[PDB]
Amino acid sequence: LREQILLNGARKARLTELVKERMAYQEYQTILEDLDAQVNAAYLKRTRT
């Protein structure tokens, strides 16, 4: 048991290094998409009219 806990902690320790960087990408994407909708939705009106 003491042999396995350390391995699990090491594995979970590494994942926390990869999760944090992926969270930042989410915030950058969630604002980029909003701009994409406006620029995309701000041209359809030209076709409509």
Add this chain to the structure above:
Amino acid sequence: NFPLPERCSPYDLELPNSISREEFQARKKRRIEERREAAKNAPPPQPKTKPTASIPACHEIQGYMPGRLEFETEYCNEAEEAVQLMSFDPGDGINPRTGELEPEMELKLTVMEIYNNRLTQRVERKKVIF
């Protein structure tokens, strides 16, 4: 002699003289009559069964095509709604005066860049699922 046959030379006249015309004609009449007799006695052709539709939906998930590796309802299947009425001005693409893309063109291309990114996001989702 790819563009031609091998016996392009008119001087070679062996095959014409190797069999007489009457003999060769006799064979033609013989093959014709038996073939006609075979056709008359031939069995009727079986009716064409229904065309073997490919039906790529074989996989045990409705709306998946293992042969094509493409789903029917993708991640953002509504991403085409923004460019399926798109049209372009003939013969344009560059401003004659300034040399830069005219304002409408640079806007039209920008709304195509988003669609390309949408396609790439789909592929990554498919890659993980495989």
